[PDB]
Design a protein around this ligand. Structure first.
Ligand SMILES: [Cl-]
Lengths: 248, 256
């Protein structure tokens, strides 16, 4: 329903076209997706759908190497994808916004939250995966996996296998957000499933511990997995966005 | 405000009178909210009054009562056990809690609510647990007993914890801790037969919020949700905390 518009991010051989779907109603919502997802995913589609009911705009886009944007995802880094998110926000966000980040998008959202001090009114983090290169991937590397990162510059995770590049892991240490106290200046809501097989729910708890006292809430779902895309999971996401909208 | 009525619970020398405050406002199965307070709590406390207020606003009944040795009920709380307080709660439910029930248990009341859910499986259609403290005798007291507290338990049958808010110290008897073992819910799986919502504060000084994670890991993979409040304490009685409590009750009311 919402048509794709595009901006060029980066210069020279790093220049790449970023696809965006900017919805305008008749406090925008901004979506930041996962590591190898795209803006047509279930949760992303439901966020713009929430914007249609709350009478607000919605900003969705695809990272480079994702969805309808240029490039190979194996050439991407957190810095590159943060850059694209900033560029899309500067181009589309005409005012206040609520950042909604899922997994790697939550890591991107937290980096954007620091540079945002439009203005941030709320944070909704879905199965948040901040610092996952240093917190989750690095401590669980087999000696055969790091040998691949040394001789090949990447490693493969077991129908197409996820490839984590050496550059992604190295750039991740320059984008760590759990370096200390995390002041977002806005209410925060975390959605997390206890049966998450990719981001252990304690990782979300560790992230929440790094946030100060003021308005951080977590909805912990006992039977939820990493995607959290069931109808009941989406219902709680919509309620978390509704809470952000009522306190803004 | 709400009239106090009483029922005798137990037989013989164990008989004791339990004070209740029954409020009466889907339609053939009018649900009742049931409050279950914490250790040494009172049915006139902040959370309990708000639960009856929520029932007055939602058009449902409300069942408030005091454990033996608590509030308006007979007895000395130092004579009580989890078994006795589960017993009284079941009797109050059987006498007043008509039809559909949503048990709202705070701290020790959450342990009682989980025991009631096991025994009732009217009928339970929801559990709201505030700062849940299941098995707190074996999980929270026993592992932190000093040598002196273990000795006074053996020598005198109790140990004391001075209170920084009241001149009366807090007492934990050997009977409460021993009988606690016969009431553990977190040994083996927990099945409640009804959706469960947990309210917990990360800054809870009396029940570590990890304790409520352990509780959730013992429950099945179906409709167990926790609202974790970053700056909440154990009381969870601020205006913002009461708000989330009413939201939790309303959510339980929409799922039958
Ligand atoms: Cl209270």
């Amino acid at each position: 329903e919402t048509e794709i518009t595009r901006i060029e991010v980066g210069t020279g051989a790093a220049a790449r076209s970023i696809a965006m779907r900017i919805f305008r109603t008749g406090p925008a919502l901004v979506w930041l997706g996962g590591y190898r997802s795209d803006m047509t995913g279930t949760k992303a589609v439901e966020v713009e759908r929430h914007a249609r009911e709350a009478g607000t705009d919605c900003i969705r886009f695809d990272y480079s190497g994702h969805g309808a944007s240029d490039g190979d995802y194996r050439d991407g880094t957190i810095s590159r994808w943060v850059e694209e998110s900033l560029a899309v926000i500067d181009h589309a966000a005409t005012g206040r916004m609520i950042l909604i980040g899922s997994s790697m998008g939550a890591w991107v959202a937290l980096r954007l939250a620091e540079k945002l001090k439009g203005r941030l009114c709320g944070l909704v983090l879905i199965a948040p995966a901040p610092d996952f290169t240093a917190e989750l991937i690095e401590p669980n590397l087999t000696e055969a996996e790091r040998t691949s990162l040394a001789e090949r510059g990447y490693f493969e995770e077991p129908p197409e296998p996820n490839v984590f590049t050496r550059a992604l892991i190295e750039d991740g240490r320059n984008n760590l957000v759990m370096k200390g106290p995390i002041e977002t200046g806005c209410p925060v809501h975390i959605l997390q499933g206890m049966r998450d097989p990719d981001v252990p729910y304690t990782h979300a708890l560790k992230l929440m511990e790094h946030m100060p006292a003021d308005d951080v809430v977590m909805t912990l779902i006992r039977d939820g997995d990493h995607r959290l895309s069931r109808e009941e999971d989406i219902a709680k996401l919509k309620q978390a966005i509704d809470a952000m909208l009522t306190k803004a």
